[PDB]
Amino acid sequence: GSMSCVFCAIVSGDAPAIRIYEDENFLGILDIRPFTRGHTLVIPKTHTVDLTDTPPETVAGMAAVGQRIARAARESGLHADGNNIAINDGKAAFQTVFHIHLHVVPRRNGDKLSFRRDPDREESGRLLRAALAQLDSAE
Amino acid sequence: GSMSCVFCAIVSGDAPAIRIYEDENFLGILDIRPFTRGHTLVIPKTHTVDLTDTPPETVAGMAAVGQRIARAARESGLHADGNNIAINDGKAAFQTVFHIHLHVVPRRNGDKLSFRRDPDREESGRLLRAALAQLDSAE
Ligand SMILES: Nc1ncnc2c1ncn2[C@@H]1O[C@H](COP(=O)(O)O)[C@@H](O)[C@H]1O
Ligand SMILES: Nc1ncnc2c1ncn2[C@@H]1O[C@H](COP(=O)(O)O)[C@@H](O)[C@H]1O
Ligand SMILES: [Zn+2]
Ligand SMILES: [Zn+2]
């Protein structure tokens, strides 16, 4: 899977990513074509393609991780006032990487975003990791 | 809550909706301003506002229900080839109803959708309910 799927390769540590979150089942990385700074992908470590073949428990967990990252962005040095959470199920819904995943796109009041390059993704990653660490400390 | 929040009112049976799904914790209804036919909102029966105050278990479950509706749309007479799942967390992310909810927007190959009126929402509801009933029978 690692040699044929870029998200499997990243999960296996065989392809590069700016990683911001990881647990037993999910990996959160920065998108390489961010809509906004801190645009994050939540990627189940098991390869399935979309909503037709992904266990509900995986979709459920992916959403929960997405929430955690959303909360972090809102308290982070990226100054998020909100977030768009998205799953693009199938090619007709804009799917281009055929390993299921969920987007967390940080938003800011008056950002005039319409639905793609971050001047310093490493900084955005560091800010999100610091915010996630802070949420962890508070619990 | 029912008199001050339109989604609470719908959950309480105090305001109209075309309902397509219901369990102990969630209600799925047709959006009144659909992006596509069968555009569905999944609404937790408990009122919370966004990702900052909604229990993770609720976000997780909302996503699972959204998946079920997505799968139904794909096998339905609305002919969905895919779906966009969205949560708009906060006003900065386009939130306009301040009771947390999740969008399932059916998509079709070559539909040229860009991110709003259904000629027959009752028909779209009937088609989704029939597809959901069919998924239930298969399990
Ligand atoms: N190697 C990669 N690392 C990080 N993000 C990626 C990589 N390849 C593709 N993406 C992103 O994954 C998303 C896939 O699109 P979609 O399938 O519509 O969610 C896009 O936003 C891409 O920019
Ligand atoms: N009474 C209602 N019944 C069904 N859908 C509604 C109603 N009022 C608002 N909506 C929809 O709820 C969504 C709220 O926007 P957002 O908060 O961005 O998800 C919009 O797509 C509205 O068209
Ligand atoms: Zn994969
Ligand atoms: Zn409410």
Obtained via which technique? X-ray
The total number of structural domains that make up chain A: 1
* Summary count for chain A: helices (H), strands (E): 3, 5
**What are the start-end ranges of the H helices in chain B?**
6-11, 56-75, 121-137
Domain coverage including residue A128: 1-139
Residue A131: which H helix or E strand, with range? helix A121-137
| In contact, A50 and A89? CB cutoff 8 Å | yes
Residue A84: which of B56, B86, B105 has the nearest Cβ?
B86
Catalytic residue among B37, B39, B68, B101: B101
- What are the beta bridge partners of residue B104? B40, B85
| Other beta carbons within 10 Å of B50 | 23
Is residue B136 part of an annotated ligand binding site?
no
C-alpha distance from B130 to closest chain A C-alpha (Å): 18
The amino acid at residue B1 is G
Residue for token pair 């139904």: B72
CATH of the domain at A73: 3.30.428.10
Query: Closest by alpha carbon to A45, among A86, A96, A2, A93?
Result: A2
| In contact, A69 and A40? CB cutoff 8 Å | yes
- Residue A110 CB burial class (10 angstroms; 0-12, 13-18, ≥19): exposed
What was the resolution (in A) of this experimentally determined structure? 1.9
- Residue A133 CB burial class (10 angstroms; 0-12, 13-18, ≥19): exposed
Between positions 72 and 131 of B, the ones with CB within 8 A of A are 74, 80-95, 105, 107-109, 111, 115
C-alpha distance from B16 to closest chain A C-alpha (Å): 27
Give the separation between CA A10 and CA A17, rounded to whole angstroms. Answer: 7
Query: Closest by alpha carbon to A124, among A67, A72, A63, A61?
Result: A72
Is residue A88 part of an annotated ligand binding site?
yes
Nearest chain A alpha carbon to B81: A92
- Residue A27 CB burial class (10 angstroms; 0-12, 13-18, ≥19): buried
Judge: A88–B86 Cβ closer than 8 Å, yes or no: no
Judge: A86–B89 Cβ closer than 8 Å, yes or no: no
Strands B40-44 and B82-89 come out as unpaired
Query: Closest by alpha carbon to A81, among B50, B44, B138, B45?
Result: B50
- Residue A101 is among the residues annotated as catalytic for this protein: yes
